[PDB]
Amino acid sequence: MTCDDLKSGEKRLIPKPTCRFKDAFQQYPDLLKSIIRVGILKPTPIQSQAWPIILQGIDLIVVAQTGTGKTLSYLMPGFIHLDNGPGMLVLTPTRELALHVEAECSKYSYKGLKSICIYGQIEDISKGVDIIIATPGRLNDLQMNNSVNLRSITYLVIDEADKMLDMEFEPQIRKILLDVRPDRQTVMTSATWPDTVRQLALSYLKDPMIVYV
Ligand SMILES: Nc1ncnc2c1ncn2[C@@H]1O[C@H](COP(=O)(O)O)[C@@H](O)[C@H]1O
Ligand SMILES: [Cl-]
């Protein structure tokens, strides 16, 4: 596992890993209690590095395949960022992944946080929602149809961006991010880091760091 500052100009110190939940989230007893109740033992390597970076308000690229704990890498700090529609948006390439993310979300949710999983409905989004987990296709069609307000989103995750590219979802994603506000925090995940994904990434992130398993 490597970590770097990809900002132009002066490089910033890399926050120290937080190898215990307590070290990342001691400030947030309700999130800790939620973790304790689930009964997992320790942060995964990428969690231990991703968390302190996101908590400092720095945009992050995580390059990592499934099984490494990448979901909680971006979900936990998103919960903290939340405490006017949803404030958090997670874009996933497929229904299966959206469902996977939504399942982790509701397993670890506390302080009456509400999430919705949206894929290929409007009524639940018309009531209060804090977190949207969505495929780009269905979410784009919803904004066009005036069904969803994205203007309160300040925490955005783009999950599996290489898959997003293979699937040619760039036009839909670009259009969704337009309704999202520019002063936002952004995390991006990807299983790979070729030049096309690097270019895409920088079209989403400002002054980002990277964690690369
Ligand atoms: N710190 C952890 N300890 C044990 N399991 C975890 C941890 N973090 C995430 N997981 C689980 O590992 C699986 C793979 O997660 P991901 O790589 O995010 O798809 C998911 O089912 C998670 O709920
Ligand atoms: Cl390193």
Author numbering: 212 to 294, 304 to 340, 347 to 439
Question: Anything the authors wrote about it?
Answer:
DExD/H-box RNA helicases, from virus and bacteria to eukaryotes, play important roles in processes including ribosome biogenesis, RNA processing and folding, ribonucleoprotein (RNP) remodeling, RNA nuclear export, the regulation of RNA translation and transcription, and nonsense-mediated RNA decay. DExD/H-box proteins often contain accessory regulatory domains and localization modules, but their cores consist of two RecA-like domains joined by a short flexible linker. The N-terminal domain is commonly referred to as conserved domain-1, or DEAD-domain, and the C-terminal domain as conserved domain-2, or helicase domain. Both domains contribute to the binding site for RNA substrates and both contribute to ATP hydrolysis. We used X-ray crystallography to determine the structures of the DEAD-domains of DDX2A, DDX2B, DDX5, DDX10, DDX18, DDX20, DDX47, DDX52, and DDX53, as well as the helicase domains of DDX25 and DDX41.
DDX53 (CAGE) is expressed in testis and various tumors, but not in other tissues. Expression of the CAGE-gene is determined by its methylation status. The 6th residue upstream of the conserved glutamine is an aromatic residue in most DEAD-box helicases. Its side chain stacks with the nucleotide base, stabilizing it in its position. Moreover, an aromatic residue in this position is not obligatory: DDX53 features an isoleucine, with weaker van-der-Waals interactions with the adenosine ring than the base stacking interactions with the aromatic side chains. In the crystal complexes with either ADP or AMP the loop closes up, resulting in a shift in Cα-atom positions by up to 3.5 Å between the ATP- and the AMP-states, or by up to 2.5 Å between the ADP- and the AMP-state.
